[PDB]
Ligand binder design. Sequence first.
Ligand code: HEM
Ligand code: PAM
Ligand code: MG
Length: 405
Amino acid sequence: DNSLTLLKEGYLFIKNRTERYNSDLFQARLLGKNFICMTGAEAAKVFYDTDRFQRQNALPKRVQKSIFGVNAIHGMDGSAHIHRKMLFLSLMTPPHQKRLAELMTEEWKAAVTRWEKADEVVLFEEAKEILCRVACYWAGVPLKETEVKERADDFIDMVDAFGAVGPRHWKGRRARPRAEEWIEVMIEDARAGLLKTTSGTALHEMAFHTQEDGSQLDSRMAAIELINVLRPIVAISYFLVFSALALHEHPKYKEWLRSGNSREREMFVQEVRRYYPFIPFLGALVKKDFVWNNCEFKKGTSVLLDLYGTNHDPRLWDHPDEFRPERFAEREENLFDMIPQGGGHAEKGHRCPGEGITIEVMKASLDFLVHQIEYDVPEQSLHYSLARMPSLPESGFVMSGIRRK
Ligand code: HEM
Ligand SMILES: CCCCCC/C=C\CCCCCCCC(=O)O
Ligand SMILES: [Mg+2]
């Protein structure tokens, strides 16, 4: 069993071995199970074949009890999964992406009034609070100013736990029942009409969603699925910090952004998502015996798809370990070569329905940093680990001398 080695190597565990064995797949004992680990765009296509792969019983209990919730969308298959996935997709269309991006812009502009007076700020901490306030407001979830930071911390504790052991994992295990109880009473109040809800917002649509047989979700399950909207919006915090890091470490792109418009901002944001680590891999179970790439996949075998390694595959990407947003000028759009938030079709599998929200929030936040304020980046540890999952520049990205531009 290689699980401790996986903990040691993190994002590079699969890529180190696919390179060493000169193969796009290898066998390994991980998580107590027999696994095949695979990488590359062709492997991602096979992974998203839902006749060959299922997610039920692929999600380790420890992941359900920390980041995702028990028996939630991530572990569902078949028409029941697709049914629930349409609920998430309806909440993440461009009107929602635009609304969230606009709320973020308003928050960043409002933040300058305090940042200019305090001089020094930790971007990760500011982002967490703003995103939590914006996510709850857009969703219709009441949120008191005195609890913004606690709820944001609970959301991040769940994200930060998914690849951890020891105290960091325990933080996520403790935060999940707090968040679920908090949101569940909201669901219950909404269903009794004791909390005002609005058609087309996340609280309303999760509270009143009906399944294929016409029954509502259990209030706890509706709460879990609403957290599966609120938590990943706060998780955009990680990408916002990596975006600011890339700006600092590749300063030639700042004037490139200042001169240009949303096209350059979008190429920059896509390169942040491709280049920096966030989700290392995905798990599934072989649904039926099949053969691919001269390997027999036996029913019941667990499988890991390498997100990070595919995103740095030199067969797909020129100089894959350099940050070069211009690579997305005149590049073909494809569902399997660029998979930091999954691959394939979100309507037909488990691909992230939040990609558009992620991208527009990142673009709005990049615009703020480039056009709205000036700032310095003082001496600090900007190192981010490829072993620690998820990963973040250690300091959280400290900014100082902040001035209204
Ligand atoms: C912040 C950066 C984000 C990253 C790195 C990310 C990444 C991912 C990945 C890798 C998956 C699983 C894909 C698969 O299993 O095939 C996923 C699923 C999901 N994401 Fe995201 N995501 C992010 C943001 C968001 C946002 C902002 C939302 C909602 C507003 C969201 C909602 C979801 C949901 C509901 C699923 C489960 C979909 C399903 O099982 O069918 N995510 N995400
Ligand atoms: C058997 C190994 C399973 C894979 C372990 C990690 C699983 C999924 C990674 C997270 C997917 C969604 C992340 C978006 C952010 C969030 O939901 O908080
Ligand atoms: Mg229904």
